Structure 1
């Protein structure tokens, strides 16, 4: 079954293009493979953008099918999509990607040194529980 539906007012994430990585809200559906869309608060001017470069989210804000850009911005701020999007696990692992991408060589060394002893404690912790299980298994 489907849980996300292309419909008037669904907040979407842009896959590729000049506006990739931003949020955008569906206003109207133009054609079978293209829809009229408007990201008034995410620096996305009102334009036509196809279904090719959009990933549709589980966020629905209500406004009429051909409402102007004023009401879309007001509904965006009333629902407060920007704060809720940052609290989504979708965006938390999105923003971690550029943190790995901008990671400096000095930052690369500190991650490697921290990964060593962090795995040391877990392996030592796991080692204590395999031997503790076998006494409990007998």
Structure 2
């Protein structure tokens, strides 16, 4: 069974291409493997984009099947997609990915020292939980 349907008004996220990493709203379907898409508030000029370079999300905003960018922009700001998108666990692990890519070597060192001590307090804890389960067993 499917949950995400390519339909007029569904917000999609572009995987590859010159716009990789931007939201965009499907306004029309040209043919089977290519859609007329437009993100007005995401710096994406209205254009034809194949269905490969897009990952359709869980956001549907309503507008007629060919309305000009002006009405798409209002429906986009009406639903306030930009803030609602940033609150999804999907976007949060997207922005958490380049945070690990922009990590400076010194920041990579500070992590190594924070990871080391954190894992110590974890492992001795579960150590105290196993010895807490064996006297629980007898």
Deviation at 1:92, TM superposition (A): 0.4
Distance (whole Å) between structure 2 residues aligned to residue 74 and residue 127 of structure 1: 56
Distance (whole Å) between structure 1 residues aligned to residue 132 and residue 36 of structure 2: 62
Unaligned runs of 5+ in 2: none
Deviation at 1:133, TM superposition (A): 0.3
Deviation at 1:86, TM superposition (A): 0.4
Deviation at 1:10, TM superposition (A): 0.2
The structure whose residues are more often helix, as a share, is: 1
Alignment of 1:75 with 2:72, yes or no, is: no
SS in 1 for 2:37: strand
Deviation at 1:75, TM superposition (A): 0.3
Distance (whole Å) between structure 1 residues aligned to residue 96 and residue 66 of structure 2: 36
Alignment of 1:52 with 2:60, yes or no, is: no
Distance (whole Å) between structure 2 residues aligned to residue 17 and residue 132 of structure 1: 54
Superposed CA offset, 1:11-69 (max 9, x none): 00000001110000000000110000000000000100010100000100000001000
Unaligned runs of 5+ in 1: none
SS in 2 for 1:120: helix
Distance (whole Å) between structure 2 residues aligned to residue 108 and residue 55 of structure 1: 31
User: After superposition, where does 1:12-31 map in structure 2 within 5 Å?
Assistant: 12-31=12-31
Distance (whole Å) between structure 1 residues aligned to residue 97 and residue 123 of structure 2: 27
Q: TM-score, normalised by structure 1?
A: 0.99
SS in 2 for 1:36: strand
Distance (whole Å) between structure 2 residues aligned to residue 132 and residue 78 of structure 1: 54
Alignment of 1:2 with 2:2, yes or no, is: yes
